[PDB]
RNA sequence: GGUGAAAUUCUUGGAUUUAUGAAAGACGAACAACUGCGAAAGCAUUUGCCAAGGAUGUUUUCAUUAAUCAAGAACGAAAGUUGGGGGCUCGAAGACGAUCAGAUACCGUCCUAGUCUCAACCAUAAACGAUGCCGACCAGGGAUCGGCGGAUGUUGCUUAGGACUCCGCCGGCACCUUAUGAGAAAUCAAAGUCUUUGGGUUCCGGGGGGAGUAUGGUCGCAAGGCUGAAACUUAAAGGAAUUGACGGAAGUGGUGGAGCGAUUUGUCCUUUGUACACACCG
């Protein structure tokens, strides 16, 4: 039964360093059963440290949707990112405030994105207080700053440079800079990106980034 | 006997007396 | 006789507190009254640690942990020895384990 | 401290300043009026320290003080003297 | 204690012991009086008139300078409000809550606060009728 | 083919009543081998036992070596939902089994389904009374 | 699948498991606290709007307008009722499967009403701090929340200000120690300022049952709610604490000191619960 399955190497876009995702498999072509629909719109949850060959990014996972089949090589594109459960459970601690923000952002290629940002209040070096809490007004100010930044980056740019912003997580650093005047923050991240609708599949656009 | 069940028993006898005398 | 000053819970300056469900028996216990423990364990038993750290493609790979906040009713917390019956004097001690 | 160590009629003036305004021997306000001196223009324009109104310079210039929860915040670049 | 709540706040102003104007006050009595008359002429109430005379003029307290209270001065010159100011503000609050409830029927909390506000209105109106600062048949609806 | 490591994804469902070791590709859309604890042992009391998990993971390792898979990704989950979130007794038995079989482990992640709230759990407000 | 173990049940017409996508209905984890808000009930996803509120600050205003309240009103968990919508999950009743000496239960499966919402009712909870509200006084202490004032020297900060730090003031939920107090004690910083008895005011108790029963009245569609006996019966019932015994709970004087006291310390099987003390064969 696993002799009628052909392995099709998976390639990540040249946005990432390593493009050696894997070799997912699909049955042989047959009546209305060519391998195209087998690999049609498959998602591949892969770690970022794999693509970036950097372990420090092991906390991040990347989803990639297979939308074409170039012979035996299947090419993928960005389909959102997320945290590992371990990192999220490590950050959410007591005696500190958690700030969460979501927003809907449109890019130049009709890609609708919902970006989720996470932030935690940071203790000062000389703090004697056993808790570090922000007032509900301060949390609302920081959520405003986080959402305005999320809109400012994602709307201006396109998916390729948007992800190029995700990988070093410069958005988190800008949020930390912009909210330092309200309340010092720690572990500020874009925890999750969800692609809600995607434009009509363009083959040349796909080969542009592959 | 538990007081809750005593009250339930008494509510039941009263239902009965009411449905007898009134009707 | 009133056994505790706080009545076995943590509720001052408020009325209703939403309940949780016991991890063991699915009992409805108030959040402030239920015994709450934050267990940070490893997905790999202390024993399998070496064998797993060996079968790893990536040489640099810290083994992921498990974080879980466990909720227990009084009956299950006593049965599981999470909390034990204490003498009258020692009950007023709220300090975490020394 | 121990009231047997003090005289309730002649309280130490150091510790009377820190008492609530109403809990003193004779209650007095801790607010004051000030001669605010602006940057270049004369416009002394006495202000209440706990002013609830945005005091504006007579020549319809920029605002001089800002209402707050307690003492009003003088605008940047202004001096003052108690009256 | 708050009349309609358990709050026990003691925040208030503390008038100075010296009942005479401070030496730095130089405005003539007639000057402050006609300032009060203009203030009431646009429509300000005595509380707002006092606030403005305090923070925009060199008048700490009207009573210290003139020797009379703002409402008395306004009554002397025939500019006192028909409805007393506190009752006016309570009735304004009541009509605002009534409008909100005409839009929001499920707001039971606002209904409870409206009951409290109207209780305050009835108290103050009873006092004003007893002191004859309201028409004997003045009625709130 | 010839690669550094032909990775696979192992879905380890470690419940308190059974254990599943489901090995798929990087997408999960193609099932390769699906061994079960109760599909080895004949006693219902032992489907969640470590012995069943060890036998199950040994069978999975054999089939994976047959298919050419040399490394595996581990997705360990409990029952989740309103039910329990602690993995069953067979989780450690399956993982060390796979590790002590020559098969390599890429990454281990907890993929137990966690509700962000939830529907009401079974057992009643008084709970299971025993 | 489910349990201690099973069985009821689903499943080669693909169960369970895996991935993707859509729809539906609930539910708002972690953060989350001896923390906040609210008259109480209660209130935890974002943003916006609407009206409301406490505290703080105030050299703003009125000037006794106040406190508590029969009558009379408003709100009032959950369950429940009438009708519409919805109906995921869970789930009274019911059916079945177990266990059992029996098992109308505990355990398991499927589930009806219900759980969600709208309109109209219902007005009850261990609705508890089992502690009505207003006011005065009388110990100490450190935390914490809200506001304000002062002093600070560091900020991935945008001079102020924020964030930390320190010192105060007011107000709030609380906590710790202590008796000079009170108490039957438990304990309580109010449950203190009581035979050295009187700040104001509302409700409300008079041995235990019968009994929140009968009847009348009133409210409610109903369920029931509010008001509410007597005859008769009985020598105790009950509270706190002590010792012992038991647990299908866990791991001997003296003198002095403490206690009203039984007792206790000394003596470091112990702790714990007890409605048992003929002491669980209760
Ligand atoms: K507890
Ligand atoms: K005030
Ligand atoms: K305080
Ligand atoms: K002795
Ligand atoms: Mg309650
Ligand atoms: Mg009652
Ligand atoms: Mg009561
Ligand atoms: Mg009460
Ligand atoms: Mg007396
Ligand atoms: Mg009696
Ligand atoms: Mg003795
Ligand atoms: Mg007891
Ligand atoms: Zn339990």
UniProtKB/Swiss-Prot annotation, chain B:
Pfam families named in the record: Ribosomal_L41
Family in the record: Belongs to the eukaryotic ribosomal protein eS32 family.
Other observations noted: Initially thought to be part of the large ribosomal subunit. Crystal structures show eS32/eL41 to be a small ribosomal subunit forming a bridge at the interface of the 2 subunits.
Highest taxon of source: Eukaryota
Quaternary structure (record): Component of the small ribosomal subunit (SSU).
GO molecular function list: structural constituent of ribosome
Keywords recorded for this protein, A-Z: Ribonucleoprotein, Ribosomal protein
Gene Ontology CC: ribonucleoprotein complex; ribosome
Taxonomic path: Eukaryota, Viridiplantae, Streptophyta, Embryophyta, Tracheophyta
Stretch list, region Disordered: 1-23
Protein's GO biological process: translation
Protein name: Small ribosomal subunit protein eS32 eS32z/eS32y/eS32x/eS32w/eS32v
Alphabetized InterPro entries for the sequence: Ribosomal_eS32
